[PDB]
C-alpha cells in the first residue's frame, strides 16, 4: 500500500470516528473529540466520493445537531477542518459552526 | 492508460558485438543438475561437465548478462562462448588461472 | 547473441528510444542515451553478473565504489539517460558503466568486495528534492517531506508558536542555536532562515554569525523599504540569501517601491503569484527581474476546480482584503509562467498555506496540466516530453539549490555532490518512492511486515532505515551554516554532530542562472481586472476537473 | 479612541474585572490586574503591532528577550493577572509590558529582531506542574505527564520490576547512574529518589553521592523506626528530602511511634490520607505537624460514587487488612483538608495506585467539588474564586518545588526561574493544554495533519516538538542532583548531557512555608469509627455523582 | 512449620520434583534442584522478607548485588533449577540463595539498600536468545527480535538494498563503519558480517580491520572454491567466523568440491537443510563434518501441512530449479536431525526467507513435534522432557554464541557473563515474555495503560523500557568487533558509544563443542529420490496439521 | 493481550481494509491502497479460519474484479502478499494477479 505518514495519520482519525459512530447509534449525546472525529471522517468520505469543497462546507453542518451532543460542545467546536484527496488533489475543507 | 507503462521501441539488440566467440559441446556427466551463469569463467565450471576445457579458456557464455544455462544430469548441449575482455585477468573460480588470460 | 527489445526492457529496464509514462500522467520520457555495453550490463543475484572474478573484481576498498545502483534510468536536468551510478564516501563517484575491469570492457564504476548493490533496473532515479520554504512548525514535517522524495529542507521557525506559524523565521542567536542542535535529529539536510526584518544591521549580522544561511523578510514583521534594505546590505556582506514575503497591504508603497528598495540586489521571492502573500494584486510582476529568483509555494499548483473556494476560505480561516489577495487571474497565469520558465522553483509553505509532502507531486501535476492545455514546449525535440520534464524537475532540485548557495553539495546527480538520491517505480513516480537515500545510506523506504519471510508482505508503509539512525544519520546529513558561523566555530561550540556544509554564491546567482527557467517576461497585471499579460497577450489557463497523482494512490 | 469591553476582550483577552470559567467547572477567575497601557498592547500578525520600528525595536539580542508570550492571563499562586511574559536564555526574564521603547511607553520586555512570539491573548498561562510521586515503571510516563502540563517529575524506579512497581526507589549507585543517563532522553526535568530503608547510614550516603535528590522510606522495604531514623540523619547531613510511605501494618509501632522516630525532622508524607499506604487508620493525623509537608496521591481526588468500589478492588488486585486501609471516612475528609490548606501537594503515585496524566485535572476536580459543597473560602475577597484557585494551583506547582528543594529553578512563573510554562485555552483549562514549553522551547503541543496547509486540520493530537529533540531537549531540561553528586562530578563522570540543577533547602522547609496550604489542624481519627475530626468537628464530604473535566473531553 | 506442596508452589513457584508444561505444548520440565533453604526464601512486598535487618542487610553497594530475581525456575543448557539470580555491574553475579547473612543461613546473593528486586516466583527464566542469521534489511527487526526474547543479533546488511535483501553482508569499510554507528541506537547486542566473496585476501582483511566479526560467503556474490578458500585463510588469520550459503547451482562443483575447498577449516553453514540455499539436493550432508557448525533458518521449522506450498511459491516469488531446491525429503529429515543433535543452532534468515520474531517459538514447535512423533530421547532420565528441552534451548543460546566467538560474554546464564535474561510466565513460554533484561536493565516488556493506576490494565503491548533509552541503552548493550578493529581503535575512531566486546575462539570451535548437539552422522542424500539416510536408515517425519504456540496467542 | 510489534502492525492493515470495505459498499471503484488492504485483510481472516495456503492463493483472486477498481489498478498489483498465523504457525500467502 506504501502508506505515507499522512495516510496512516488519517487512519487514526477514521478509527476515532468509528468509536463516535457506534456511540451515536446507541443514542448517546456525543462529547468533544467524538463530535470532531465523526464530522471530519464524514468530510473525508465526501472528498473520496468526488463531492466539491463548496458542497462539503455546507453538508458538514448537517451531521450533528445541538441535540445529539453534550452541553457546551457546540461552543467548543466553532469549526472543524480536515484535508482529503479530492479527484483534483488534497484540499482543505473548513466546516464553519457545524453544530446547531 | 497504465501507470508507468513502457512504450518499447520494436527490434532486437545485438550483444557482445565485435568480440571473439566459439562453440563447445558440453555434457553433464554428474548425477545432479548444474547451472552456469553468463560471466562465469567457463573453463573452470564444475568438473562433472565434460568438454574441451582448453578451448573455453578465457571465455564465458555468450548469453544475456545475468542469465544462465542449465544442464540436467546427463544433458548434452552445444553452447556458444564469448571471450572475456577488459584486462583479461582471471581471479577466482576454481583458482586455476589467477592472473592474466 | 540478440535479445528482443521487449525482453531487454523487461530484463534491464528500458534503453535508448524506449518511452516511459510518468505515473498516471500524460507525461512520457524517452531514453536519450544508455552508457552500457550491450551484453555487459551488471545485475545482482543467484548466478548473476556481480560475483567474484566476474562483474565483481579484486580491488581494495579505495579502488572500488561503496555502492552501485545498477541500470538506473536517470531523470535529471541534464538528461534522461540509462546508467549505473557509483556512490563512494557518501558522494556521487561516477555516472557510467559498473563492473570488473579484469574481464569487462569500458568499466567506469569498479565493483569489489567493499561494494553494496541497489538494483535500479526498471526504476527511475532522481536527485533528492530541495524545499526552500519550510515553516519549522513541527519536527514531523521532516519525515513527511523525506518520504515524498525531499532530502533538503531550508526554512525557519521554532515550533508551533505564532511567529513560525506565520513566517519562515528562527529569531535570534539562542533559537537559531537550539534549532541547529535539534536539526541533528532529523534525516534531511537543513539550513535555517533568521528574522530579516530590522533596520539596525547588527541584529542581522548576529543571527547570520549564529548560523542562519539566509534571512526571511516577511510582512508580518514589517516588510518595509528600510527593513528590506538592511537585510539586503547584510546578505551582500555575508553571502547569504534573502527570501521575501512582501507588503500585501501596499502600506509602505506598491510593488514598484519594494522593487526600488531591493535596488537590483539578489533576492528569492516566495509564492511569487501572491495568493501565499505579497503586494496586491501585482507581486507576480517580480518575475521580470534579473535579480529575482521566483518560486511558487504549492497550494495553487496546479489550478483546479476547488482551488479558489478552498483558498478564499483558507485565507479567511487563517473581505476586500481576502478578495484582493486570492485571484483566479493570477492563479490561472502562474501555471503557465511555470510552463514558460518565468517561475523557477516550487516549494511548500509548510503548514502555513502549503503541503509539506506535495512539492514534487504538484510540480508534476502542473507539467501534466500544461501539456494537456498547451501541447509541446517550443524546446521539445522528439516525440516525448523530455524538455518539459527537465524544465520542471529543475524547479524542485537544482534551482532551489542554486538559489540558496548549496548547489555545490546538493541539487542534482553530478559527480562530487552528496549522494541524496530517490529511486522510483515509474507507476508511482513523483508520489511514493521505492527508496530514499541520504548521503549514500537508505534513510527511509516502504517496508512490509517486519516479522515476514520477505520484506514485501503487507502492511507496507514508510519506515525509517539505517541512514535515519543516530550517528549514521549524523554522518549522512548536512547542517548548512553561514560562512561567518562556520568560521566562528558555531559547529564546535554547539557540539553539532552532523556533517557541516557552508553556503556560498547566494548573491551572485541571478535569474539567467535558473536551469531551464530563466525567462524574464515583460509582464503586467491590470489594476482593475487583475489580468496578467506578457507583451499584451493574456496569460491564462483552465482549472482541472481531476488530476493524475491523486485518488488512484492515496488511502485518504 | 475607545473600544467596548467585549470587543477588547475579544481582541486581547480579558482585562481587569472580567471573569473566566475554568473549563466546565463552577470555578471562576477574575482578572486582578493588567500590566498593559490600553492602546499599547502588542499583537503579532499582518499589519499588526510587532513589526520593525513599531512594537519591534532595533536592539541587539542581548538587549531583547528570545521569546514573548503576548497578552497572557497568568494564573499562579501570587495572582491572576494580565501581562506579557518575556523569556530569555531559557528563563523567565520579566512579567510586564512588551514592546519597543523607541516609540512605546512603559516597555519592560523589549522585542527585537531576535524575539519569537507566542500569541497568549485569550489564553491562560501557568507554570509547569511538578509531580513528586513518580514510580519509574516505564519511560512512557514522561510524555504522558508532559502532555498533562507536568514539566518536572521526581520519583524513583528502574522500570517494570517488583521493587519499582511497589515503591518510588532507584536502588544503588549503578541503577541511579543508569537512570540519570536515561533521564537525558526524556523531555521533563527529573530528580531521582534512592531506597532510604537501611539502618547503616553509609549505604544511603553512597546513593546520595550517586545522584539521588531524596530518599524514599517505604514499608515494603521495612518502614521501621531505625530505618526512618537513619534516612533522616543522612537527609539532614546531605540536604536532600525524605519521602515517607509508612508502616500500614502497625508492625514496629503506631503512627505516634513513627512520629516519635521522625523526631520533629523534615519529611514529605506521601498519600497522607492513607488509602495509598500508611499506619491504619490514622496516618492522616501527620498533617498536624510543623515538620511534615503532606501530599495526597490522586486516585482519591476527589471523592466520587465509584471511589470506594474501585479502590477496595484495586487494593485487593494489587480482608480485614483491605478494610482497615480503604476507608470512606478518611477518603471523605481528605477533600476538605485540601480545601482548608491542611494538605499541601497533589501528586500521582504513577501506575502504582495513581494516574500520571491526571494530577492537574483531579486537583481542579477537587476545588470544584469543594466550592460546590462548601461555598467560598474564608479567604475569598470578591465575587470569584481567585483565592481557592491560588490555594489549589500551589499544590501541584510551588509546594512540590519547595518540598524537594528545587523551588529556586522551577515551580512558578517568577523572574529567574526556568521557563517551563503551559498555555491553556480556558475551555480546556486543566485537561488538554494548547502549548507545553520546556526551558523556553515548545516541547509538546496538539498538532494537526503534518501534510496540511495549516496546523489545525484533523487529526489533532499531541506530538513532540523541537524542545523534545536530542540536544535542544538536553539544553531545555534539568537533571537535579544532590549537592554531593554535583560536587563529585557525577555529571561529568556519566557524561550526562542535560543542564544540571542542584537541590538545596530540603531540610529547612516546613509546613508554614507551603504557599496558601500551611494549616496545622488538631486532627484526630477515631480508632473504632475512623471518623476524622479537627477540634471535635467531624470533617466529611459527599461523593460526586459526575465531575467536570471528564466525559465532555475524553475519547475513552 | 510445614506447608503443603501445592501452597508452596503457589507461593514461591515450583520446587524439586514438580513439573511444568511449556506453553500449550506437550513438553514438560521437572525441577531438578532447588538452591533455597525451605523457610528462608526471599519474597518482596508489604510485610515480606526483603526489608531492612530481615532479608535485606546493612552492606555497602560493593558488597551486595544491584539486582536480585527471586525464586526463578532457570531453564538453561546446564539444568532446570530453582534459584535466586543476583546481577551486579550488568553481569551475572551468582545463581544461588539471596538474602541477608546477618540473620539468614546459606546466603550466596547478598541483598542491601543498593538492590532492586524482580519477583521471579512462578516464572521461568532463560538466557537471551542469539540469532546469527540476520539480514539488516530494516532497524525495526531489532525490537521485533528483542520482544521475542532474542538479545543478540549477528548478521550483515545496509538496509533495504538488493545486496542485503539477498545476503547477510555489510560490504566494505564505509558501510561497516555506518552500521557500527547505527548499532548504538538499537537495544540488542550486535556483531556484523562483511562480504566474504573475493579471491584477493586484502579486501577481506580491510573489512575485518573495519569491525566485522565474521564473513558471509553467499552464492549471489559467487560461492566458488577460490572465494571460500580466501575467506577461510583470512578467518584463520584474524580469528573471525565464516558463514556459508553455498553454490546451489552446483556451478563451480558439487557439495563435495565445496567441502574439499573448506579443507577441514571451521565454518558455520547457514540453512544446512538447503531450502534457504545450498548445493541441490545434498548440502544437508555437511552436518557429518567435524569442522562444520550447522544451523537451520526458521521457515522449515517444524515441517507442517502448508510448508511446501508456501515455500515453493515463496522461492518462485523471490521450474526445475525451484523443484531441486525445495524438497519434502530434506525438509522432513531436518526436524529429526535437530532432534538427534546433528543440527546445532536455529536462526531466522530475517526477511530473507525467515521470520525475525519466531526463532524461539519455532525451535520449541520442533521439540514438541519430535516428542509427539518420536517419543523420549535416549538421553532422558525421568518422567519429563528435561534433556530434550536442554538440547533445544542450546540451539538458540549457547551454540550460536560459541559459533561466533562470543560465548565468553553471552549465551547462557553463567557467572561473569552479560545479564541478558528473559522472564517468562510458563503459559506464554517461548511466545510472549514477561520481561526482557539487557545487561542488567529491563529493555522491553509488555506494558498496560500508561495513565492507569496500575501497569496491568489494557491495552497491554510491548513498549521499550529504560535499558532501551539513549546512554543507559549504550551502557547495557555490546557492540562486538574483531580483534583487529578493537586493536586499531575503530571504537574510538567512530565514537561508538556502547560497551565493546571482542570475538575470539571462532576457529577453535568445532562440532564436538556444540552443547548437546554434537552428532556427526554418516548421512547421505539419494541423488534421484532425495531421501536422506543416516547409515542406510531413512530419516523422515510427518507434517503437522496444527502447532502449539500459534492461534491461541496471536491476534493475527 | 501482550501485543508484539507484528500484531499491532496487522491492526493497521485491518483498519486500512475497513476503509476500503466501506467504500466498496457505497459502490466506488477502489484505488491502489484500498484494493491491496481489502484483499490482504481477507487473506488474514481465511488463515484465522484455518483455510490452507493453497486455497487462499486461489480465493484471494476472487475478491476484486477489474470492474470494481479504478483504471490501472489491476496493472499496479501483480500480486498481493501477507502472512498470518494459520493453525500450523505463520505462513506467507502470495495471491498472484488478483484482479481481473
Ligand atoms: Ni509567505
Ligand atoms: Ni511561508
Ligand atoms: Ni506509597
Ligand atoms: Ni507510590
Ligand atoms: Ni542464505
Ligand atoms: Ni540469509
Swiss-Prot record, chains A, F:
Highest taxon listed in the record's lineage: Bacteria
SUPFAM superfamilies assigned: Urease, gamma-subunit (SSF54111)
Field pH dependence: Optimum pH is 7.75.
Molecular functions per Gene Ontology: nickel cation binding; urease activity
Regulation (activators, inhibitors): The apoenzyme can be activated in vitro in the presence of nickel ions and carbon dioxide, which promotes carbamylation of 'Lys-217' of the UreC (alpha) subunit.
Keywords, sorted A to Z: Cytoplasm, Hydrolase
InterPro entries noted in UniProt: Urease_gamma, Urease_gamma/gamma-beta_su, Urease_gamma_sf, Urease_subunit
Location of the protein in the cell: Cytoplasm
Enzyme class (EC, first level): hydrolase
Quaternary assembly: Heterotrimer of UreA (gamma), UreB (beta) and UreC (alpha) subunits. Three heterotrimers associate to form the active enzyme. The apoenzyme interacts with an accessory complex composed of UreD, UreF and UreG, which is required for the assembly of the nickel containing metallocenter of UreC. The UreE protein may also play a direct role as a metallochaperone in nickel transfer to the urease apoprotein.
Protein name, entry field: Urease subunit gamma
Protein source organism: Klebsiella aerogenes (Enterobacter aerogenes)
Gene it is expressed from: ureA
Swiss-Prot record, chain B:
Documented effect of changing residue 41 to A: Reduces activity by 30% and reduces thermal stability above 50 degrees Celsius
Activity modulation: The apoenzyme can be activated in vitro in the presence of nickel ions and carbon dioxide, which promotes carboxylation of 'Lys-217' of the UreC (alpha) subunit.
Pathway where it operates: Nitrogen metabolism; urea degradation; CO(2) and NH(3) from urea (urease route): step 1/1
Gene Ontology biological process terms, A to Z: urea catabolic process
Predominant location category: cytoplasm
Pfam families referenced in this protein's UniProt entry, alphabetically: Urease_beta
Localization terms from the record: Cytoplasm
pH-dependence annotation: Optimum pH is 7.75.
One CC-aspect GO term: urease complex
Catalysis performed (reactions): urea + 2 H2O + H(+) = hydrogencarbonate + 2 NH4(+)
InterPro entries: Urease_beta-like, Urease_betasu_sf, Urease_subunit
KW Lipid biosynthesis (keyword) present: no
Keyword Hydrolase: yes
GO molecular-function terms, A-Z: urease activity
Keywords recorded for this protein, A-Z: Cytoplasm, Hydrolase
EC number in record: 3.5.1.5
Protein family (similarity comment): Belongs to the urease beta subunit family.
Subunit-level organization: Heterotrimer of UreA (gamma), UreB (beta) and UreC (alpha) subunits. Three heterotrimers associate to form the active enzyme. The apoenzyme interacts with an accessory complex composed of UreD, UreF and UreG, which is required for the assembly of the nickel containing metallocenter of UreC. The UreE protein may also play a direct role as a metallochaperone in nickel transfer to the urease apoprotein.
Protein name according to UniProt: Urease subunit beta
Organism encoding this protein: Klebsiella aerogenes (Enterobacter aerogenes)
Swiss-Prot record, chains C, D, E:
Substrates-to-products reaction catalysed: urea + 2 H2O + H(+) = hydrogencarbonate + 2 NH4(+)
Stated consequence of mutating residue 220 to N: Reduces activity 50-fold
Cofactor binding, per record: Binds 2 nickel ions per subunit.
EC number per UniProt: 3.5.1.5
Activity regulation annotation text: The apoenzyme can be activated in vitro in the presence of nickel ions and carbon dioxide, which promotes carboxylation of Lys-216.
Positions of substrate binding: 218
Mutagenesis / variant outcome for changing residue 318 to Y: Abrogates activity
Modified residues (N6-carboxylysine): 216
Main location (coarse class): cytoplasm
Pathway listed: Nitrogen metabolism; urea degradation; CO(2) and NH(3) from urea (urease route): step 1/1
Family, per entry: Belongs to the metallo-dependent hydrolases superfamily. Urease alpha subunit family.
Protein name per the record: Urease subunit alpha
Organism of this sequence: Klebsiella aerogenes
Lineage: Bacteria, Pseudomonadati, Pseudomonadota, Gammaproteobacteria, Enterobacterales
Protein's gene: ureC
